[PDB]
Write an enzyme that holds these catalytic residues in place. Structure first.
Site, PDB file in Angstrom:
ATOM      1  CE  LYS A  32      10.191   2.373  29.772  1.00  0.00           C
ATOM      2  NZ  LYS A  32      11.154   1.766  30.748  1.00  0.00           N
ATOM      3  CG  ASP A  34      11.701  -0.745  28.468  1.00  0.00           C
ATOM      4  OD1 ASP A  34      10.711  -1.386  28.902  1.00  0.00           O
ATOM      5  OD2 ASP A  34      12.329   0.133  29.090  1.00  0.00           O
TER       6      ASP A  34
END
Ligand SMILES: COc1ccc(CC(=O)Nc2cn([C@H]3C[C@@H](O)C3)cn2)cc1
EC number: 2.7.11.22
Length: 290
Positions: free
Chosen positions: A121, A119
């Site tokens: 980011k 994940d």
């Protein structure tokens, strides 16, 4: 938890909330994440051993009144805020390159230990005054899970998700992190997110509109993926010169390899480190106003 003094709310990451805090005994300033199944406890305990200069150190894991607290080394700013603050003039290319180089070192380390982020980011990429950049939350998604909405009902971003995850591959690999990092690399250069989808299908179709709808030639096995539909529109691929304009041919070549559709053809962190784009890498100091 009594051992820490909260200073301020840092944010609402996935997994619970994050506070800047001070250890009452040591005087150490840390980031405390308030997130428990034994499986999650054991997996989280093994992340304490995963130490690298480009990985945010997990200092301690605290389990009491059966809630979980993760204590991390603290860094003053994240890349999302840094990109937002650098939007008028852009992050200098040499600093983009150093940051990419260091993040690939971090990924190469975790991936060699078979640990994935899943994940990535800009908000989980932390920076300091010295020019270092570090990856936060490695291994956590595998330990607990990744929501649709955060604990605050905030919408988890899909912008950096690899296409094999969007097509339902259940056993995705370390290549998903390379894809997210490629997307970040492109965003630093252009100053606009590469694929800002607001739904899973919008995310997939933005990917297809730029890189071409994938088929069996470029990605063997893609039409048999769980969520693949023959009715997907077929769009032609665009040239990278149009997708991240300012970037030179070394950078476009590396980006193209970080964005290969087939997870098996996608470059590894280790091979990306030897790409000719890093022939003149240096370590500049960023302009950080704290
Ligand atoms: C002033 O208010 C802030 C201060 C710092 C920051 C940057 C930041 O997020 N710093 C940080 C976060 N973490 C840990 C929590 C785990 O997810 C990674 C360590 N340092 C954001 C807001």
């Amino acid at each position: 938890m009594e051992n820490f003094q909260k200073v301020e709310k840092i944010g609402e990451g996935t997994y619970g909330v994050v506070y800047k805090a001070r250890n009452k005994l040591t005087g150490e300033v840390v980031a405390l994440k308030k997130i428990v199944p034994s499986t999650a406890i054991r997996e989280i305990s093994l992340l304490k051993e995963l130490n690298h200069p480009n990985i945010v150190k997990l200092l301690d894991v605290i389990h009491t009144e059966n809630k979980l607290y993760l204590v991390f080394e603290f860094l003053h700013q994240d890349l999302k805020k840094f990109m937002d603050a650098s939007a008028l003039t852009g992050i200098p290319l040499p600093l983009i390159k150093s940051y990419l180089f260091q993040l690939l070192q971090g990924l190469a380390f975790c991936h060699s230990h078979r640990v994935l982020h899943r994940d990535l980011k800009p908000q989980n990429l932390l920076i300091n005054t010295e020019g270092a950049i570090k990856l936060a939350d490695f291994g956590l998604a595998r330990a607990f899970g990744v929501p649709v909405r955060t604990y605050t009902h905030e919408v988890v971003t899909l912008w950096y998700r690899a296409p094999e995850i969007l097509l339902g591959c259940k056993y995705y690999s370390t290549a998903v992190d390379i894809w997210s990092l490629g997307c970040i690399f492109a965003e630093m250069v252009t100053r606009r997110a590469l694929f800002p989808g607001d739904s899973e299908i919008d995310q997939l179709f933005r990917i297809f509109r730029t890189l071409g709808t994938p088929d069996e030639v470029v990605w063997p096995g893609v039409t048999s993926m769980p969520d693949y539909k023959p009715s997907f529109p077929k769009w032609a691929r665009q040239d990278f010169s149009k997708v991240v304009p300012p970037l030179d041919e070394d950078g476009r070549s590396l980006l193209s390899q970080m964005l290969h559709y087939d997870p098996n053809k996608r470059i590894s962190a280790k091979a990306a480190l030897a790409h000719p784009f890093f022939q003149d890498v240096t370590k500049p100091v960023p302009h950080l106003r704290l």
